[PDB]
Design a protein around this nucleic acid. Structure first.
Ligand SMILES: [Zn+2]
Lengths: 114, 83, 23, 181, 69
RNA sequence: CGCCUCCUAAAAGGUAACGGAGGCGCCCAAAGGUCCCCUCAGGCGGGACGGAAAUCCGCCGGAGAGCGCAAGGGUAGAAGG
RNA sequence: GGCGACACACGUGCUACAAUGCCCACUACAAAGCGAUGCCACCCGGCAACGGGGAGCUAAUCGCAAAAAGGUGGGCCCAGUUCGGAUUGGGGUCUGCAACCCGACCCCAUGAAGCCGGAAUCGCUAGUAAUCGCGGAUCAGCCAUGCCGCGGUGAAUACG
RNA sequence: CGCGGGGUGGAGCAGCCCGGUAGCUCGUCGGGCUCAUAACCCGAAGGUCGUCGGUUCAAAUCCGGCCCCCGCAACCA
RNA sequence: GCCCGGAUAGCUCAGUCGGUAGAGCAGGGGAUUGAAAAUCCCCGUGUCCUUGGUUCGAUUCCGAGUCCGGGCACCA
């Protein structure tokens, strides 16, 4: 379908685009504009010339699914290499952005270990 | 982050020392109390014992640490787990 | 929800303005 | 037999090419594509979903040829599989279906591979035999995302008359196999 | 070939995401694809398709060198 | 305590001991008959999941596999599939 | 530098797990305070944060400042969702001498748990609960969901 | 060492016969209730099931050897 | 070997002399309770062991078989 995945036909293209990893409401709200595509049309409600327009466009606008995940892990990979404090947090798998490490770090630490 | 409208803050005396050893070539391992500065591309190839609160921790400056603060690579806290 | 910066309501509860809460 | 334009490429380009690069003193010395083995080590219908004829359905759609069943060569405890037990499909793609499937493979499947950085330039048997793996089967144009129900990749055994991996990867290279490195 | 087991191929109309037609022999007469070799990145110089920077790090020292010295 | 295999057991057979080892008290309606077809173990290397070992492929293998169950004998130029 | 750690455990809060909802746009309706190196109208640039200008205000008159929920229309159509925003990557604005530990805010992307929660347990009897938003103190900044107040809507129930 | 039996999570025990998955009580930990403790409640975790070899695709679960324990017997003089 | 007994809700067992598969036990939930509880309210779930035949229909009735249990013997 599109760059990495398929959009849900019964859903409008707006949320469908955002289903692409590497695309939120913003780029979803924009690529339809640069491709002049009506967002209200469901994914099943999409013509080929529209999609190929949008497909080639968005696929040529931003790295979305795989290439994006490359740099993401890459950015954290390169962090872990230099040994920055941030890299320390990742290599420790602890809250990287100054969160209160003592409590409420389950999102970074997962299950509890009492 | 520091506003790019504002200059890249770097502790001048430490920065100046780096520019000094540049003329004098890579040598004179620099102890620094100046955790807060950002590494400058000149600083690459140098080394600094960055002060960690009690100690000056030696850090070799590579290009992978240019756009960062000095103190980042000096972990001010020592953690080892529990038990 | 109220904790979403991207939501206008979030900036409302945040009491700020961004791309999604004009002034 | 029918026509397959890629095989045509092999005769027209690949044959004179390898004759050039290598100077085979007899045309039966240039490498050739023996067959393409398609394996799927399912390991799922061994106990449950015993009619995985959806699998042979997909393989038939991909090759126009219903594959063979590979059964339990002997029971295993660690793997919940006793002997005499279907664990995998397999087919022997040959001349027509061989060159056809290869044409579809280079032309469609590889470009549809996710983050396809190319093929392993080292996945060689040594005997001028290349292998690889898949993490799904919906890569092919025959298979639509609707019809596909569960990703089952595979391993594909491209066999070649050549003896060395050098002449082999020479051959496939001439065929334009996108090598990753 | 066991005559009646093998799903029969036909002249296959392949259509790329670029609409690039690659006619071959497949079980379905015409089939669309989101990509061809003539459009896949790995064949077209990779194009970078989003980012040709190629390891922006380290610098890329924009807003740098403005030090007073 | 009956029968099977081995050593005891001295290159025929047989050959004792409360001698050294183990098995059997069934099973297969196919594990039988015939015709036809195939050849293993194992190792390497490559191969999505997938491993040490699933299935695949190529490479080397005389039998070291298998042959319903103890051992022995027999055995792929098949008794094995 | 630490008071910000962090396998853990408890208290107190906020946000939620959705359609009596969520998002968008327009349209309303307050109170109470604050403000001269401060509110900053308004204008421009900027996706925005914000920055460049810039009047008035020296306070019922200038501004903060829009109340929000509410109402209209639109979308979503039960979906881990246009729910959820946690985390994280990156790019920025501002303050600050300096935001690595250790600030906030903007933008992009990421989109965690969570489907109303065991044992247990809390508050509330009226403009109360509940819910919505607004101001001030400290403060350059803000780690404020806190605190103190202010107002909008606005309940059920009390046999005993 | 003769014969029978047994040796499962921290404790006691169960699953062995029939090899496919080991459960109960107590106990541990966390929380709850209490002014605190006990009791009680919610919740969770927690087992080469003696050793070593063979059987088996696979062994606590089959077989053998070993160790420990228990029991019975160790006589006719 | 002979005789007879039942195969029913997760269980126990009802079961038509053919119109319906049900009582309670277990399960869950609701109220319930300080815990324990009990209680209470409501849902739980079946080829009526299989085959057949009959009659409009058969859980029923029945022929067979199996399991199933017991007894009654006999053992060269
Ligand atoms: Zn194309």
């Amino acid at each position: 379908r599109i760059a990495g995945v398929e959009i849900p036909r019964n859903k409008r293209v707006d949320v469908a685009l955002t289903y692409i990893y590497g695309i939120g409401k913003a780029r979803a709200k924009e690529a339809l504009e640069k491709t002049g595509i009506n967002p209200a049309t469901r994914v099943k409600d999409l013509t080929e010339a529209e999609v190929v327009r949008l497909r080639e466009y968005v696929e040529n606008t931003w790295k979305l699914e795989g290439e994006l995940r490359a740099e993401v892990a890459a950015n954290i990979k390169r962090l872990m290499d230099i040994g920055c404090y941030r890299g320390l947090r990742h290599r420790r798998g602890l809250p990287v952005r100054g969160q209160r490490t003592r409590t409420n770090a389950r999102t970074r630490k997962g299950p509890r270990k009492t | 982050p520091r506003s790019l409208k504002k200059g890249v803050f770097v502790d001048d005396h430490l920065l100046e020392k780096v520019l000094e050893l540049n003329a004098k070539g890579e040598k004179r391992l620099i102890k620094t109390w100046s955790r807060r500065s950002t590494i400058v591309p000149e600083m690459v190839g140098h080394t600094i014992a960055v002060y960690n609160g009690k100690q000056h921790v030696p850090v070799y400056i590579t290009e992978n640490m240019v756009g960062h603060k000095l103190g980042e690579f000096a972990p001010t806290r020592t953690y080892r787990g529990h038990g | 929800g109220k904790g979403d910066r991207r939501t206008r309501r979030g900036k409302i509860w945040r009491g700020t303005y961004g791309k999604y809460r004009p002034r | 037999p029918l026509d397959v334009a890629l095989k045509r490429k092999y005769y027209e380009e690949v044959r004179p090419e390898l004759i050039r690069r290598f100077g085979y003193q007899n045309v039966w010395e240039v490498p050739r594509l023996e067959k393409v083995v398609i394996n799927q080590g399912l390991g799922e219908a061994k106990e449950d979903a015993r009619i995985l004829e959806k699998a042979a359905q997909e393989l038939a759609l991909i090759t126009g040829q219903k594959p063979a069943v590979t059964r339990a060569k002997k029971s295993i405890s660690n793997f919940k599989l006793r002997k005499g037990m279907p664990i995998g499909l397999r087919v022997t793609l040959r001349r027509d279906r061989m060159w056809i499937f290869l044409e579809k493979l280079l032309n469609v499947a590889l470009p549809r591979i996710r983050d396809f950085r190319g093929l392993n330039p080292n996945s060689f048997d040594g005997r001028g035999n290349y292998n690889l793996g898949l993490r799904e089967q919906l890569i092919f144009p025959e298979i639509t995302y609707d019809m596909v129900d569960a990703l089952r990749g595979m391993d594909i055994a491209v066999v070649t008359t050549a003896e060395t991996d050098e002449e082999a990867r020479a051959l496939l290279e001439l065929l334009g196999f996108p090598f990753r490195k | 070939m066991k005559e009646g087991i093998h799903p029969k191929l036909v002249p296959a109309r392949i259509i790329c995401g670029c609409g690039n037609v690659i006619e071959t022999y497949s079980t379905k007469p015409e089939i669309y694809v989101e990509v061809c070799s003539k459009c896949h990145p790995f064949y077209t110089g990779q194009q970078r398709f989003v980012d040709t920077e190629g390891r922006v790090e380290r610098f890329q020292r924009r807003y740098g060198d403005s030090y007073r010295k």
